[PDB]
């Protein structure tokens, strides 16, 4: 059977700038159960239909994964900018496929905070659709180079969400896969 | 040294046009993310628009659709075109550079009157 | 929608004092605070970010605290050009750049 269990139900997700990707092919799923299932707080699909899913054929599946923000979820999208959609996991004007996530609070928040989490701040062009940057380079921010050392105009390009139990929504982490379907 | 110069303020009749202009010094406004941020008269800090280095552009619900943010990087300028004024956008308007929020590099100010 | 709200809205204190303003966020936002302050007619200057990190060139008799849903702003010992306006600001805040009302700090007699 497909291994959708070892994708949503990983013990450590990556980071939004690091994202995974997992090729399900060469197996049997059942769609129909995930689209049931309570837990996901998101379940949006675009060109395709959730309960139809399973009558289709498709060429390739991809399985796309990594934690953000719920105040960022919405950028998960066709069509969408931010900070996410610009800089760190870009989805195509003509995405097929499906996006799902889920609150993780209990999984990926710490007292004190859990700063394992990561995303891209600077980056001097938007991401292409489908695209995975994960340099650290200092960032340029004015015309003097930065030669490796951070200071003034000279940053970091990744920061740490940081999450916190004690949260609110908006800020809490949210388990976030992207079902894109060759078809 | 590093600094951010505004002008175009001036007076404005309500439903009329006017465009700021900020012309940095010491940063590179095109690969910063550049704000207008206000202050009426007696009043607080108002965020107005937000300019991305990759091009995405923000602005608060108060002015939406009526201001376009905009940059010229020949001329390492940011931009303010502010259309159908009303009176209530009466304010001193700067513009600044964030860093992860927090706005490190401020203008002067430039202020902005809309009466009849 | 979180709601920033500063207290005092009004502060009377004399050179050589402590001085503790207050800023409250309605939910968590961990640490996802700055500070500022402002002075008549002057664009705000920046004293604080990630609600304890003191900006460089600020003198160190400021600091900042606070996790959460609770954050101060103290200056050890106020000297006189430390009477002005002080802002709060929620940090990656949806909607976004959303300030705190204000704390005026005046001169005690």
């Known amino acids: 059977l497909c291994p959708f269990g070892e994708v949503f139900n990983a013990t450590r997700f990556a980071s939004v700038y690091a994202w995974n990707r997992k090729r399900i092919s060469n197996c049997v799923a059942d769609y129909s159960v995930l689209y049931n299932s309570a837990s996901f707080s998101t379940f949006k699909c675009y060109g395709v239909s959730p309960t139809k899913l399973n009558d289709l054929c498709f060429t390739n599946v991809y399985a796309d994964s990594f934690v953000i923000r719920g105040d960022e979820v919405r950028q998960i999208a066709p069509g969408q900018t931010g900070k996410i959609a610009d800089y760190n996991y870009k989805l195509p004007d003509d995405f097929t496929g499906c996006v799902i996530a889920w609150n993780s609070n209990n999984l990926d928040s710490k007292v004190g905070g859990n700063y394992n989490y990561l995303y891209r701040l600077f980056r001097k062009s938007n991401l292409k659709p489908f695209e995975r940057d994960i340099s650290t380079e200092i960032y340029q921010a004015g015309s003097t180079p930065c030669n490796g050392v951070e200071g003034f105009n000279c940053y970091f390009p990744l920061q740490s969400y940081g999450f916190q139990p004690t949260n609110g929504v908006g800020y809490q982490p949210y388990r976030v896969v992207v079902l894109s379907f060759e078809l | 040294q590093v600094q951010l110069v505004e002008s175009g303020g001036g007076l404005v009749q309500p439903g009329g046009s006017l465009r700021l202009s900020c012309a940095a010094s010491?940063?590179?406004?095109?690969?910063?993310?550049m704000s207008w941020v206000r202050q009426a008269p007696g009043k607080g800090l108002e965020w107005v628009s937000v300019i991305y280095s990759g091009g995405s552009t923000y602005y608060a619900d108060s002015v939406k659709g009526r201001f376009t943010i905009s940059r010229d990087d020949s001329k390492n300028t940011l931009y303010l075109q502010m259309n159908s004024l009303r009176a209530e956008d009466t304010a001193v308007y700067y513009c600044?550079?964030?860093?992860?929020?927090?706005?490190?590099?401020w203008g002067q100010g430039t202020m902005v009157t809309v009466s009849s | 929608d979180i709601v920033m709200t500063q207290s005092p809205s009004f502060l009377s204190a004399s050179v050589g004092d402590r001085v503790t303003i207050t800023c409250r966020a309605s939910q968590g936002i961990s640490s996802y605070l700055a500070w500022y302050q402002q002075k008549p007619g002057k664009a705000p200057k920046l004293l604080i970010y990630a609600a304890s990190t003191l900006q460089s060139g600020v003198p160190s008799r400021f600091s900042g605290s606070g996790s959460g849903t609770e954050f101060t702003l103290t200056i050890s010992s106020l000297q006189p050009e430390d009477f002005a306006t002080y802002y709060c600001?929620?940090?990656?805040?949806?909607?976004?750049?959303?300030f705190g009302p204000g704390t005026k700090v005046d001169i005690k007699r």
């Open positions: 600044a550079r964030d860093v992860a929020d927090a706005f490190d590099i």
């Open positions: 600001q929620q940090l990656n805040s949806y909607p976004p750049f959303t």
């Open positions: 010491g940063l590179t406004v095109s690969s910063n993310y």
